[PDB]
């Protein structure tokens, strides 16, 4: 059977006071016609459907319009819950979606269920795993929660394997978490910020497919081809190019995985990041000097040098008058702000000489002055110690 696997839509996301409604509408239309054409039998969204817990009105308009236009196909939508999605909002409309060939799961502990294909035959089973809350599964700490997620996954794969009987039914699993060796971005919020850092790929149970998504860039974990991310179908935080936006059309063969076709999503609103000094910024602005693009590409100017003190935004706007581009940001860069730490525990155990050392570091000390003033200090402590 054929599923489409996609994740991390982030509907109703606020992107520097810009609405992404046109891009989500184009993508949902495209997904409807692609699901018609390629003869798919299910669609799986693995978490982060909505961006906030109280999404706007047009976000719920988009999602309801997509689900109601899915009804004219014979398909079957499966919706998971990410770390952004509110639990009770999805649980309120749990069973009223079940009358529309659509199943949602937000809490932890749903029994794994079979799926129909487009002719009512039981095609595959899946164990739906949403984003597990650290209060939901448990009753040092990192191995505790790691083993908790591990035995949870083992338990649900055991129940799905028992449900399959002795029939040609593949196991699909879901997830919304981060794993080892993950191309993390800035749209990705951090889960288990006190407990975990990643998840080992070998802790997953073996299955015919493991559809995850938390990281918004498509990649494969380790070398296991049956375990894939999908990432967002749109750019979310300027770190993602307009080419790596894929939806995985997965097709199975007689109980085992056959193919994972990475069909790509066309771009409606392009983005562009601009780094360096101002002359290199102008040289990168040169590549739009003539082209007529009707949706203006959103820029993110990042200054690397010390030109931050000058009247930047007036100069950049005076540059970008003529060419049809649109600017969203002017900043000193992250790579500049990476190494601005340059430090620092406390002054509790820190000695007065080290306070005195930090006093001298602002001065112009010489080897006399780091031994004439320093000897006068170090004595006069122990004239009073």
């Amino acid at each position: 059977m054929r599923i489409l696997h996609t994740s991390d839509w982030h509907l109703g996301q606020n992107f520097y006071s810009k609405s992404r409604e046109a891009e989500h509408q184009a993508f949902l239309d495209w997904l409807l016609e692609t699901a018609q054409t390629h003869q798919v039998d299910a669609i799986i969204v693995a978490g982060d459907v909505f961006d906030t817990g109280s999404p706007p009105s047009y976000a719920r308009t988009l999602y309801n319009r997509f689900v109601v236009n899915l009804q004219q196909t014979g398909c079957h939508l499966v919706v998971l819950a990410g770390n952004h999605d509110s639990v009770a909002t999805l649980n309120e409309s749990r069973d009223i979606m079940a009358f529309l060939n659509t199943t949602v799961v937000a809490s932890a502990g749903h029994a794994p269920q079979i799926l129909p294909r487009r002719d009512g035959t039981p095609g595959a089973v899946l164990c739906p795993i949403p984003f597990l809350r650290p209060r939901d599964i448990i009753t040092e700490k990192q191995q505790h929660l790691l083993a908790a997620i591990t035995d949870y996954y083992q338990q649900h794969y055991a129940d799905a394997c028992k449900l399959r009987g002795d029939q040609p039914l593949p196991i699909i699993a879901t997830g919304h978490l981060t794993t080892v060796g993950a191309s993390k971005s800035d749209a990705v919020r951090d889960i288990y910020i006190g407990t975990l850092d990643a998840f080992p790929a070998q802790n997953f149970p073996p299955a015919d497919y493991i559809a995850l998504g938390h990281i918004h860039r498509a990649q494969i974990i380790g070398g296991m081809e049956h375990v894939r991310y999908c990432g967002s179908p749109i750019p979310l935080s300027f770190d993602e190019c307009g080419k790596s936006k894929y939806v995985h059309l997965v097709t199975f063969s007689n109980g085992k995985l056959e193919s994972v076709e990475n069909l790509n999503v066309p771009v409606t609103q392009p983005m562009a990041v601009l780094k360096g000094d101002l002359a290199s910024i102008t040289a990168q602005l040169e590549q739009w000097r003539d082209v007529s693009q009707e949706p203006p590409v959103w820029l993110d100017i990042e200054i690397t040098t010390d030109e931050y003190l000058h009247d930047i935004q007036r100069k950049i706007q005076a540059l970008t008058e003529s060419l049809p581009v649109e600017v969203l940001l002017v900043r000193r860069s992250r790579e500049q702000r990476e190494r601005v730490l340059a430090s620092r525990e406390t002054l509790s155990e820190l000695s007065v000489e080290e306070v005195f050392n930090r006093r001298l570091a602002l001065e112009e000390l010489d080897e006399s002055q780091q031994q004439r003033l320093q000897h006068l200090f170090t004595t006069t402590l122990h004239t009073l110690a």
């Binding site: 700490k141 910020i193 931050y308 930047i312 935004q313 406390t346 002054l347 306070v355 006093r359 004439r372």
Partner: protein, 364 residues
């Protein structure tokens, strides 16, 4: 300075006698908890009990004397607040009771009686409001002014530490790190100068001041570093920065503009709440030798944030759930009741006018 328990009785719309304990099973695990209820249910009462038992005062009612006890519940005979607090491994408890005359629901307000015991050896330490106030001021280090600056941000006044005058901030940073030796070292150089020429000019050492101002500036720089670590998740636009002045003072850096710096009294209401919450959470995580701020309670500022900013700030609030500090947040917003697992729920009883807590906290 941490809060272990809290016992109150007829303090406000909370009738009866109640006791919550932060060393019991729901609070020792998570640390971050919430106090949730409808409008007018009695949520601020559980913080006014702490302020009353410690500093004989609440941020609304400036005195509770022989005259003018506007606190006690209508048609009740008496009230008492009692807190238990630990400083440096020592578990003291404070006490504050007041009775009307002859147990009558209307009578003469009598004289309040106070204890301030030690509770390890079981001895008492004070019996008057003066002795109790000066003993707790020298015991915890926190006066009532510094208490509302640091450990308890009351309703509508979350910006008490961010928008303070320089001398109150100087007193609080002087209390966090005992810097008398930094004045003592910079006292004798005034006579050791009278080479000591360049040193007494560089290390300003007249009456033990300029070196101590340098130590305060270093403590503020560490605190501002911790505050920016917290603030990079809550509101990514601003950054705190200890500005260059002879009086220690912070200001905000607007990263969304070029890098333009401006003072803290130009922020918004919601932005000022976020910056003050970040600063208070930094002041909790700071370590020192003199005094430690473990417990932290804050009233509602969350109404000033809109939906998406509230989502971002409340998602960034779960980082303290893997700690051992007891941050206790208070709001009524419908987003907060599901995002936080451990809750104290305050229920009004049938519109009689009184209210009650959950059934575990009854003293029976």
């Amino acid at each position: 300075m941490k809060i272990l328990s809290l016992r109150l009785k007829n303090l406000n719309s909370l009738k009866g006698e109640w006791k919550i304990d932060f060393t019991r099973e729901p609070f020792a695990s998570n640390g971050l908890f919430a106090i949730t209820g409808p409008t007018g249910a009695g949520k601020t009462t559980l913080l006014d009990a702490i302020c009353l038992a410690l500093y004989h005062e609440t941020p609304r009612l400036s005195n509770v004397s022989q005259s003018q006890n506007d606190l006690m519940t209508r048609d009740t005979a008496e009230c008492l607040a009692e807190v238990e607090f630990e400083v440096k491994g020592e578990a003291y408890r404070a006490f504050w009771s007041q009775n009307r005359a002859r147990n009558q629901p209307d009578g003469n307000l009598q004289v309040p009686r106070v204890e301030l015991a030690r509770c390890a050896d079981g001895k008492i330490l004070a019996d008057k409001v003066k002795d109790k106030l000066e003993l707790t001021a020298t015991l915890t280090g926190l006066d009532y002014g510094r208490f509302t600056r640091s450990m308890l941000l009351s309703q509508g006044q979350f910006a008490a530490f961010l928008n303070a005058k320089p001398k109150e901030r100087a007193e609080l940073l002087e209390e966090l790190t005992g810097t008398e030796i930094y004045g003592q070292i910079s006292a004798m150089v005034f006579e050791q100068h009278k080479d000591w020429g360049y040193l007494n000019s560089l290390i300003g050492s007249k009456e033990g001041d300029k070196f101590r101002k340098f130590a305060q500036g270093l403590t503020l720089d560490n605190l501002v570093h911790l505050a920016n670590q917290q603030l990079t998740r809550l509101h990514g636009r601003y950054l705190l920065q200890r500005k260059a002045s002879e009086a220690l003072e912070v200001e905000v850096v607007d990263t969304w503009q070029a890098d333009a710096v401006r003072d803290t009294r130009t922020l918004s209401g919601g932005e000022s709440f976020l910056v003050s919450l970040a600063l208070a959470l930094a002041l909790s995580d700071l370590v020192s030798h003199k005094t430690r701020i473990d417990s932290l309670f804050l009233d509602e500022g969350f109404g000033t944030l809109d939906s998406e900013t509230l989502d971002t700030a409340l998602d960034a609030l779960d980082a303290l759930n893997a700690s051992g500090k007891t941050i206790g947040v208070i709001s009524h917003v419908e987003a907060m009741k599901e995002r936080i697992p451990v809750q104290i729920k305050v229920k009004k009883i049938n519109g009689l006018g009184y209210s009650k807590l959950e059934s575990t906290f009854a003293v029976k």
